[PDB]
Symmetry: C2
Subunit: 308 residues, 2 copies
């Protein structure tokens, strides 16, 4: 039983302040997510989800996917679902969060200068060498363990080259990709994995058969990061309801524009109570994934993957 979400390592550097970083039970699931749903919601505006790919016969298999927790009226910066290393400091208000968390983000985005800055600010603590030093280092080491696990370019890092993943279908078919793939490559191993687990391809080619799961992108990748935006026009309606919203800062005053329905819909809903429902979620679709026939795809372990 191991808690595998990165931000679960967040403890206060002040040993006198008891702090328990909260996470979903899915943190103990040994899978490709190295972030637990509670964190994912709270920091990347996403919710975990599974896409059960079915066959025409009785066979099937499951693939992970996430969905937006981004509203219809959000704009600009608010659409940056996963920021790049050049703007995550503007997207995440690092000053408003715990230094253990700050540290983690800088490790995720490889900002060693900031990592060292944190160290330098804390080394003057009167009880630094006594307890703070140890605590900080522990958090660091744990985070690094995970980062190295996901990073395909580390010592003895196993990497699968049997699967391709492109975020540019028009050049993906030629097995080359485009700017979005260059950008993808510029992310840390963790972040690349995160994107791979959250964003499903529009197309999936297994062997030769091409499965178009969706004929329409729901998100894009650009120089600002993974962006929760519609590439062809008006944003999709997305009701950001409660039960996946938490007032993690009881004293922080926060306002919101809320869409409210009026009229008595209960009777209508009762007349339609006997039919199967289709969810109004907005899952992440983008790109072209290719699985070669020789790939042991159904393996239940974790392994970094990369495009040759």
């Amino acid at each position: 039983r191991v808690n595998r979400c990165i931000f679960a390592s967040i403890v206060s550097f002040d040993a006198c302040i008891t702090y328990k970083s909260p996470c979903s039970p899915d943190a103990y699931h040994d899978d490709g997510w190295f972030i637990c749903n509670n964190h994912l919601i709270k920091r990347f505006k996403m919710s975990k989800m599974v896409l059960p790919i079915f066959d025409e016969d009785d066979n099937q298999f499951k693939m992970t996917i996430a969905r937006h927790l981004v509203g219809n009226k959000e704009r600009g910066i608010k659409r940056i679902l996963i920021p790049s290393a050049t703007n995550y400091q503007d997207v995440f208000n690092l000053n408003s969060m715990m230094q253990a968390e700050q540290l983690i983000f800088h490790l995720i985005y490889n900002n060693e200068n900031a990592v060292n800055t944190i160290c330098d600010n804390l080394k003057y603590t009167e009880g630094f060498t006594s307890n703070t030093q140890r605590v900080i280092h522990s958090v660091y080491a744990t985070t690094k363990s995970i980062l190295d696990t996901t990073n395909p370019n580390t010592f003895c890092s196993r990497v699968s080259r049997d699967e391709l993943r492109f975020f540019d279908v028009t050049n993906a078919r030629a097995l080359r990709g485009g700017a979005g793939d260059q950008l993808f490559n510029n992310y840390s191993g963790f972040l690349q994995n995160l994107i791979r687990r959250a964003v499903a391809p529009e197309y999936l080619q297994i062997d030769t058969e091409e499965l178009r799961f969706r004929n329409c992108a729901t998100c894009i990748i650009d120089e600002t990061g993974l962006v929760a935006s519609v590439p062809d026009g008006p944003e999709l309606y997305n009701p950001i309801r409660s039960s996946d919203i938490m007032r993690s800062q009881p004293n922080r005053l926060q306002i919101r524009n809320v869409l409210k329905f009026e009229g008595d819909t209960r009777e209508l809903d009762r007349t339609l109570s006997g039919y199967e429902e289709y969810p109004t979620y907005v899952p992440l679709f983008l790109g072209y994934q290719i699985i070669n026939s020789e790939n042991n795809f159904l393996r239940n372990d974790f392994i970094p993957r990369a495009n040759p």
Copy 2:
């Protein structure tokens, strides 16, 4: 308790044959679906579903929608869902089905010549005036009741004008509708109802508040009918399962080309067993629906509404 399934009236004209028309339980649901799911599947390759549209503050708003039962290899009449009056007799192999249901289809598509042809052929028999005539007429009258119920141009037909529905968003912006709507308007009241009932709009404007439920279409209406296709590229993958497939005629020899997955996927199922799943269905989307601010949209009755 009233069975409102069109085709429930199907019974053999030969009185010695106790033919039963097996409509599903939803035939007794008083709503816009004047066809039961079994027949909807059987004849139109669709499955009944609901879009539980939610606001951002505890209100639910269900809406009907159908699901496609067409794969990604089918084409032409194999992909046409609801054929026009000019080709339904080519799409539906009427010569291999019961005369009672042939009659119904001709009533649906206003083919009076065929209606009369059926009548005439049945006139010349042993119990025409004794039993068959009555049975035929009963079926006819029942069907007509349904057709008139849905037809907005009938005597004292209750018609709502609190909703506009276009199957051409570009032109719908100016409330035009284009050729798509012109084609739509050539369908019977029943068929126009069915199409609106099954096909959800990409856009929904309620009192100027525009929502977007899907950024790309999944349905196309043209001169051949309602077609299960896409605006561009290859067709969407759609795993048609045996749970929807029904062997109506066991003597009819039929070959299917289906896919098969190999490998043990149960481990992945276990791995992801604690996550919420998003379906791989392909719902019917096409159009721009506009709701008048002074509507009575939430009524639980049936009104054959229509564009003015």
